[PDB]
């Protein structure tokens, strides 16, 4: 015979737009994540700071 | 001679005249600068009057102070001797390990709480001469009577506690 489908007729393919939308780039969970680290941060850079500080007394 | 950091010495000028007889003798202070360091606040504590003396004869002689204060510049010397004949008498194996660690650490005080409050301890106990820093901040525990330090590049272990005199 020939290359013909087959009888049922092959099954229908992706072709419509799919980008979904994904949370590891939503801007609120990101925003909310970076506040975090800097507010970590600068507590522990006040901690840090004032220690190096109290160093620099008992060198001199 | 000045002040002034040189940038360009190629040579050392030494004198080997004396001072004259007239001006009573000292012998000189022989310690290194890791040894003084770890002996600092012990001579700190007991020669602080001769130290705020010897400086406050200098301001009262502006200009004049190298001579004039000879007398009190010698006492200074002896104080500070004191403390080194009576730590190298009573606490010889932990000064040596605090000013051989201090030495290996780049004289960093906060490198060396463990062997320093060893010798804090010992020195207490034989010569009643206390480490003491003015006006730290009271909301706080003292620096150096701190069980972690933020700046030590090995961690304190947690066997290894701080000297509280009185405990
Ligand atoms: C690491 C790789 C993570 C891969 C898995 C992932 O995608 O996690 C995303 C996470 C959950 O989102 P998800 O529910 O999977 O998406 C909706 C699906 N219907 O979505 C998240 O919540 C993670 C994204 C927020 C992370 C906040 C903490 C880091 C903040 C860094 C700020 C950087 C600023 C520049
Ligand atoms: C580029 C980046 C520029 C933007 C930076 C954006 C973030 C800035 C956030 C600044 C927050 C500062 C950190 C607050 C803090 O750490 O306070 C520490 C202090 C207590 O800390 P302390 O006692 O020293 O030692 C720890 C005791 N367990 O707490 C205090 O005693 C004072 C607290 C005052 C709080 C004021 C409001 C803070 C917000």
Same mark, same amino acid.
């Given at each position: 015979?020939?290359?013909?489908?087959?009888?049922?007729?092959?099954?229908?393919?992706?072709?419509?737009?799919?980008?979904?939308?994904?949370?590891?780039?939503?801007?609120?969970?990101?925003?909310?994540?970076?506040?975090?680290?800097?507010?970590?941060?600068?507590?522990?850079?006040?901690?840090?700071?004032?220690?190096?500080?109290?160093?620099?007394?008992?060198?001199? | 001679?000045?002040?002034?950091?040189?940038?360009?010495?190629?040579?050392?000028?030494?004198?080997?005249?004396?001072?004259?007889?007239?001006?009573?003798?000292?012998?000189?202070?022989?310690?290194?600068?890791?040894?003084?360091? /770890?002996?600092?606040?012990? @001579?700190?504590?007991? *020669?602080?009057?001769?130290?705020?003396?010897?400086? =406050? +004869?200098?301001?009262? !002689?502006?200009?004049?102070?190298?001579?004039?204060?000879?007398?009190?510049?010698?006492?200074?010397?002896?104080?500070?001797? /004191?403390?080194?004949?009576? @730590?190298?008498?009573? *606490?010889?194996?932990?000064?040596?390990?605090?000013? =051989? +660690?201090?030495?290996? !650490?780049?004289?960093?005080?906060?490198?060396?709480?463990?062997?320093?409050?060893?010798?804090?301890?010992?020195?207490?106990?034989?010569?009643?001469?206390?480490?003491?820093?003015?006006?730290?901040?009271?909301?706080?525990?003292?620096?150096?009577?701190?069980?972690?330090?933020?700046?030590?590049?090995?961690?304190?272990?947690?066997?290894?506690?701080?000297?509280?005199?009185?405990?």
């Amino acid at each position: 015979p020939q290359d013909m489908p087959p009888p049922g007729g092959y099954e229908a393919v992706q072709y419509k737009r799919n980008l979904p939308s994904r949370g590891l780039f939503r801007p609120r969970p990101l925003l909310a994540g970076a506040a975090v680290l800097m507010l970590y941060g600068w507590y522990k850079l006040v901690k840090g700071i004032r220690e190096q500080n109290e160093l620099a007394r008992e060198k001199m | 001679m000045a002040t002034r950091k040189p940038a360009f010495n190629q040579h050392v000028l030494l004198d080997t005249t004396p001072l004259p007889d007239s001006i009573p003798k000292v012998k000189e202070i022989g310690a290194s600068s890791a040894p003084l360091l /770890s002996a600092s606040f012990f @001579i700190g504590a007991r *020669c602080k009057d001769y130290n705020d003396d010897y400086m =406050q +004869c200098k301001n009262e !002689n502006p200009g004049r102070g190298e001579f004039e204060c000879l007398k009190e510049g010698r006492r200074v010397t002896r104080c500070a001797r /004191s403390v080194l004949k009576d @730590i190298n008498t009573h *606490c010889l194996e932990q000064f040596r390990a605090h000013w =051989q +660690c201090l030495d290996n !650490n780049n004289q960093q005080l906060w490198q060396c709480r463990p062997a320093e409050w060893k010798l804090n301890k010992c020195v207490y106990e034989n010569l009643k001469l206390e480490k003491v820093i003015p006006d730290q901040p009271k909301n706080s525990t003292p620096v150096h009577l701190r069980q972690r330090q933020i700046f030590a590049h090995h961690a304190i272990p947690p066997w290894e506690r701080p000297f509280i005199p009185g405990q």
